[PDB]
Design a protein around this motif. Sequence first.
Motif, PDB file in Angstrom:
ATOM      1  N   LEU A  40       0.839  -1.191   0.000  1.00  0.00           N
ATOM      2  CA  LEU A  40       0.000   0.000   0.000  1.00  0.00           C
ATOM      3  C   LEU A  40       0.881   1.251   0.000  1.00  0.00           C
ATOM      4  O   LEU A  40       0.617   2.207  -0.730  1.00  0.00           O
ATOM      5  CB  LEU A  40      -0.921  -0.001   1.228  1.00  0.00           C
ATOM      6  CG  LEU A  40      -2.104  -0.977   1.203  1.00  0.00           C
ATOM      7  CD1 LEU A  40      -2.737  -1.088   2.587  1.00  0.00           C
ATOM      8  CD2 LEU A  40      -3.133  -0.490   0.181  1.00  0.00           C
ATOM      9  N   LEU A  47      -2.567   5.245  -5.058  1.00  0.00           N
ATOM     10  CA  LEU A  47      -3.668   5.055  -4.122  1.00  0.00           C
ATOM     11  C   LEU A  47      -4.300   6.407  -3.775  1.00  0.00           C
ATOM     12  O   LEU A  47      -5.522   6.567  -3.831  1.00  0.00           O
ATOM     13  CB  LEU A  47      -3.161   4.384  -2.841  1.00  0.00           C
ATOM     14  CG  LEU A  47      -4.193   4.080  -1.753  1.00  0.00           C
ATOM     15  CD1 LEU A  47      -5.090   2.926  -2.191  1.00  0.00           C
ATOM     16  CD2 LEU A  47      -3.477   3.717  -0.469  1.00  0.00           C
ATOM     17  N   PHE A 110      -3.898  -0.088  -7.663  1.00  0.00           N
ATOM     18  CA  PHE A 110      -4.028   0.768  -6.500  1.00  0.00           C
ATOM     19  C   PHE A 110      -4.774   2.075  -6.754  1.00  0.00           C
ATOM     20  O   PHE A 110      -5.324   2.660  -5.827  1.00  0.00           O
ATOM     21  CB  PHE A 110      -2.646   0.987  -5.882  1.00  0.00           C
ATOM     22  CG  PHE A 110      -2.118  -0.244  -5.199  1.00  0.00           C
ATOM     23  CD1 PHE A 110      -2.538  -0.570  -3.915  1.00  0.00           C
ATOM     24  CD2 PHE A 110      -1.300  -1.139  -5.881  1.00  0.00           C
ATOM     25  CE1 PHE A 110      -2.157  -1.776  -3.319  1.00  0.00           C
ATOM     26  CE2 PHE A 110      -0.914  -2.345  -5.298  1.00  0.00           C
ATOM     27  CZ  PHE A 110      -1.345  -2.664  -4.015  1.00  0.00           C
ATOM     28  N   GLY A 114      -8.027   2.949  -4.575  1.00  0.00           N
ATOM     29  CA  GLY A 114      -8.211   4.239  -3.931  1.00  0.00           C
ATOM     30  C   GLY A 114      -9.613   4.768  -4.187  1.00  0.00           C
ATOM     31  O   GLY A 114     -10.244   5.333  -3.294  1.00  0.00           O
TER      32      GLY A 114
END
Length: 245
Positions: A40, A47, A110, A114
Amino acid sequence: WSAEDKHKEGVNSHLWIVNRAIDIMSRNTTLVKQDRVAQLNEWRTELENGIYAANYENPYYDNSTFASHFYDPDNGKTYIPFAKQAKETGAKYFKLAGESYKNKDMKQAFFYLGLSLHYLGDVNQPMHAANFTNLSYPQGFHSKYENFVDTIKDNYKVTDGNGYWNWKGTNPEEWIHGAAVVAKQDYSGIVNDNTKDWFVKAAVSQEYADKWRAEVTPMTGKRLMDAQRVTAGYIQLWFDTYGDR
Ligand SMILES: [Zn+2]
Ligand SMILES: [Zn+2]
Ligand SMILES: [Zn+2]
């Protein structure tokens, strides 16, 4: 919630919620594979871009109507008839994110995650779960409430490693709906005749500005804490689903 700055928590409640959820994951030493937190953070730029983009461009902000950022669990609708709602939209990006992840396209994965997290975050905002927009009476209250939240959110950080692991089924839609159900229940604790009355009188009397602000703080703290725990669980579900197993 607010998402004013792409990389700063100060004016981005959405990012704050996600960052606090990641912290919950880092604090958990019995169930979470920390390699997930490392990933992450490795694609944090993408993200954060996804968390931010939801409120500033099509098709995510629905031609500036933000119809997809709302979802009433009781009728399964957003505030505009026949428009797309947060449940189907958040679930859409949860799945698109996973497919990219399995195909090793991390940037795409990602970014979409998000976006999915943004929608999940929004249904935790009682107003978004009751179709109370910035145009609903008293008009302007919605945006000022979210502005105020940014000034006090740091006082309600979850400091343990207990996310709502496996809170709902494996279907992301269930999590979004479940979150909305809880949020809508807490609606009256924020929007009622008192807060409406004071918000109106706050235009001329700063004394009333303090009154509605203090009045909605308790429930706000509870909502933010729940949002953190649910988001942590949601992220864990994503990895358990697409992390190869
Ligand atoms: Zn929001
Ligand atoms: Zn809002
Ligand atoms: Zn939103």
